[PDB]
Design a protein around this ligand. Structure first.
Ligand SMILES: CC(=O)N[C@@H]1[C@@H](O)[C@H](O)[C@@H](CO)O[C@H]1O
Ligand SMILES: CC(=O)N[C@@H]1[C@@H](O)[C@H](O)[C@@H](CO)O[C@H]1O
Ligand SMILES: *[C@@H]1O[C@H](CO)[C@@H](O)[C@H](O)[C@H]1NC(C)=O
Ligand SMILES: *[C@@H]1O[C@H](CO)[C@@H](O)[C@H](O)[C@H]1NC(C)=O
Lengths: 351, 350
C-alpha cells in the first residue's frame, strides 16, 4: 500500500503490476487459440459423426460460437489498452534506469590547495569523481502485495528525484578545522552534486560551520515528469474498460456451455425428438435434464472424459495419393486437415 | 543513414523504426480477423448452398483452411518477437528522455571571491544540478523495412561526464591561476558536462587556467546496452522472416489460386472426378476452364460475383414463433452462423 522508495523498487513494482495485465491477456490469447480449435473440432465432427453422436454435438455448436465470438471481441477491446500500458510502463522503466544511475549522486570536485600557495593546477584536484554515475546492479532484496484486487488503491509510482543539490564543504587554516578564516594555502574546498525529492537550502547552518558538508543551493531536476503518472493511468484504463481478463471462458468447460439458452434449446430439438421447438419451455425441464445427463454424463460430468474424447475419435476423410483414406480428428489434428475433411464430406454427400 | 546525434532524434528514429514492424503486425492481426470471418462464411455457405454453388465453394474451403492456419501460425511466431521489440525500444526511449534532459550539461558552481572569505553570495553561479526542461525542437533520414539491414546501431550520446574548470585571477580576471595564486579578484568555476568521448584537457589548462577546459572525465554510461538490445530485437523479427505475418487474404483470389490445396479440389468438385487425389488427374486446360467458369476468367469475378453469391446464401434463423431463414450477409455474425450450422445438420438428420 506504501509507495515505492528507490528506483530499483519502483521499476520492479511497476513491471510486476504490468505483468498482472499482460499475463491475463496472454491467458486470453491461449484460450482463443484453444477455443478456435475446439469450434473447428465441433463443426468437423458434427458433419462426420453418426447420428447418435451428431445429436450430442449439435447442442454445443451455437453455444461454442457464442463463446468464441465473445472471446475474440474481448481480446480485440483489450488489445489497444494493453499495448498502451506496455509502452507507457516500459518508457517509465527506462527513466527509472537513469534514476538508479543517479541514486548515489554525481560525485565531487575537491581542491586541496596543498599548504604552500594558492596557485592552482589539476594536481590540486584530489577528488574529481564529478560526473561518475552508479554502476552496480540492483540489490537482490529490495518492496508489498501485488494483484488485480489491490490495484484500485495502489499509489502512483514515486518520482524519487525532483531537485539537484550543490553540496559544499570549505575548510581554511592549518589542519582544516576552522570555517571559511579566508581561504588560504591549507584550505580544502569540495563541491559536489546530489539529488533528492525535496528542495534544500542549508546555508544558514553552513555559513557558521563551513567544514560540514551541506546542500547550499537546489535546482530543479524533474526527470520523470508525468511519465509514471501516465503509466499508472494506462493500467487504470484497462480496469475501467473491464478488459483485465479477456477471453476467460472455454468451450471445453461444460459450465460455459450449459448456461447458454441455445444449448438447452438444441437439447430439446436434437435429443428429445422435438426439432421444431424454439423455446426452452417446449419440453419439461426434467426431460431436458435427463437428456443432458444421458448425453454428457450426470450434470455434464463426462463432458471432457467422454464427450470430447468421442469427438476427437470421430473418423474423417484424409487425402492420400493412392486414394482417400480415413483417420480420427485427433490424429489429423490441424485446421488444414479438418477443412479438407469438411470439403470431402460435403462432396461425398453431393456425389 | 548516418547515426543519430541527439537524444530527441535517436528516440524519434527508434520509435519510427519500431512502427514499421508494429504496423505490419497490426495488418496481420486485421487480416486474421478477416480471414477467420471468411472461412466461417465458407463453411456455413458450403453446408447451406444449392449444389451448383456448393461445388464452387468447396475448392475455396480447403484452400481457406490452409491460408487461415498459416496466417495464425505466422502471427504466433511473430507475436513474442514484436512484444520483445516493443518492450526494449520503449525502455531505451525512456533513457533517451533523460539523455535529453542532460544534453546541455548540469550547470556549474562559480565562486567570485576585497578578500578570500567565502559565503554563498560570492557564488555568482549556482546552476549545478539544473536539467534541461524544454521540449524537443520541431541529425534526423530514410526509414523503411528495405533500409533496416543498413541502419547503424543507435548512438549512446553520453558515455562520460566531464569536470569543467575555470580559474581566472587578478583584477579583471585576466591571468591564469598556475602563476597567479587565487586572490580576491579571482573567479573559480567548476561545472559538469557530458559527451560521447573521454576528455582530459589538463595539460593545456595547467598553463592557462582562465580558459574553461574539461580537466577530468568519468564514466557516465547511461544507456549501457539498452539501445543496442532494442536494435537487435528489431533484427530478430527480420531474422525470423516474421516482419509481415498473415499477409495473405482468403478474399484475394491470387492467394487462393496459389494455395496448394486449391487445384485438386477444383478437379474433385468442378471436373466431376471426386476420387481424384493428384493434379495430374486432369489436364491443366480443363482445370483452367473450370476455374474461369466458376470464378470468372482468371478469378476476375471472385469478389464481384462469387463472394456476393456466397453472402446471399439463405440459412436458418432462430425465432420464437418458429425457425425463419435469412442470408449469411444479413445474419453476418459467427454466433448466428454456428447456430445455423446446427440447425442445418439437424434438418438433414430429420
Ligand atoms: C536498474 C535495473 O533494473 N538494473 C538491472 C540490474 O539490477 C540487473 O542485474 C541487470 C541484469 O538483469 O539488469 C539491469
Ligand atoms: C524527449 C521527448 O521526447 N520529449 C517530448 C517533447 O518533445 C514533447 O513535446 C512532449 C509532449 O508530448 O513530450 C516529451
Ligand atoms: C515522458 O516524458 C517525456 C519528457 O521527458 C515526454 O516526451 C513523453 O511524452 C512522456 N511520455 C509519455 C508516455 O507521456
Ligand atoms: C537496460 O539497462 C539496465 C541498466 O540500467 C538493465 O537493468 C536492463 O536489463 C536493461 N534492459 C534490457 C532490456 O536489457
Amino acid at each position: 500500500n506504501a509507495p515505492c522508495t528507490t528506483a530499483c523498487g519502483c521499476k520492479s513494482r511497476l513491471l510486476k503490476r504490468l505483468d498482472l495485465y499482460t499475463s491475463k491477456y496472454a491467458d486470453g490469447i491461449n484460450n482463443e487459440r484453444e477455443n478456435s480449435e475446439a469450434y473447428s473440432k465441433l463443426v468437423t465432427a458434427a458433419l462426420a459423426a453418426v447420428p447418435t453422436m451428431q445429436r450430442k454435438i449439435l447442442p454445443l455448436l451455437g453455444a461454442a460460437a457464442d463463446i468464441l465470438d465473445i472471446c475474440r471481441r474481448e481480446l480485440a477491446t483489450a488489445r489497444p489498452l494493453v499495448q498502451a500500458a506496455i509502452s507507457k510502463i516500459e518508457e517509465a522503466a527506462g527513466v527509472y534506469n537513469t534514476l538508479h544511475k543517479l541514486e548515489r549522486g554525481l560525485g565531487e570536485a575537491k581542491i586541496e590547495f596543498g599548504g604552500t600557495d594558492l596557485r592552482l593546477t589539476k594536481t590540486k584536484f584530489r577528488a574529481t569523481s564529478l560526473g561518475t554515475i552508479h554502476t552496480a546492479d540492483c540489490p537482490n532484496a529490495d518492496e508489498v502485495k501485488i494483484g488485480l484486487e489491490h490495484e484500485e488503491n495502489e499509489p502512483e509510482p514515486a518520482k524519487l528525484i525532483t531537485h539537484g543539490h550543490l553540496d559544499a564543504t570549505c575548510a581554511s587554516g592549518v589542519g582544516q578545522s576552522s570555517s571559511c578564516t579566508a581561504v588560504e594555502a591549507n584550505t580544502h574546498l569540495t563541491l559536489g552534486l546530489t539529488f533528492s525529492g525535496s528542495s534544500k537550502d542549508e546555508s544558514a547552518t553552513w555559513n557558521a560551520a563551513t567544514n560540514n558538508k551541506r546542500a547550499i543551493h537546489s535546482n530543479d531536476a524533474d526527470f520523470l515528469g508525468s511519465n509514471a503518472t501516465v503509466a499508472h493511468e494506462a493500467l487504470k484504463a484497462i480496469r475501467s474498460a473491464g478488459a483485465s481478463t479477456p477471453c476467460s471462458s472455454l468451450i471445453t468447460d461444460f459450465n460455459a456451455v450449459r448456461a447458454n439458452p441455445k444449448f438447452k434449446l438444441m437439447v430439446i430439438k436434437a435429443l428429445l425428438n422435438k426439432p421444431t421447438a424454439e423455446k426452452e419451455s417446449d419440453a419439461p425441464a426434467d426431460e431436458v435434464n435427463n437428456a443432458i445427463n444421458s448425453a454428457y454424463g450426470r450434470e455434464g460430468s463426462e463432458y471432457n472424459t467422454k464427450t470430447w474424447k468421442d469427438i476427437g475419435s470421430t473418423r474423417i476423410p484424409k487425402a492420400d495419393p493412392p486414394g482417400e483414406k480415413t483417420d480420427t480428428i485427433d490424429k489429423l489434428s490441424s485446421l488444414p486437415q479438418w477443412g479438407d475433411a469438411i470439403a470431402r464430406l460435403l462432396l461425398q454427400e453431393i456425389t
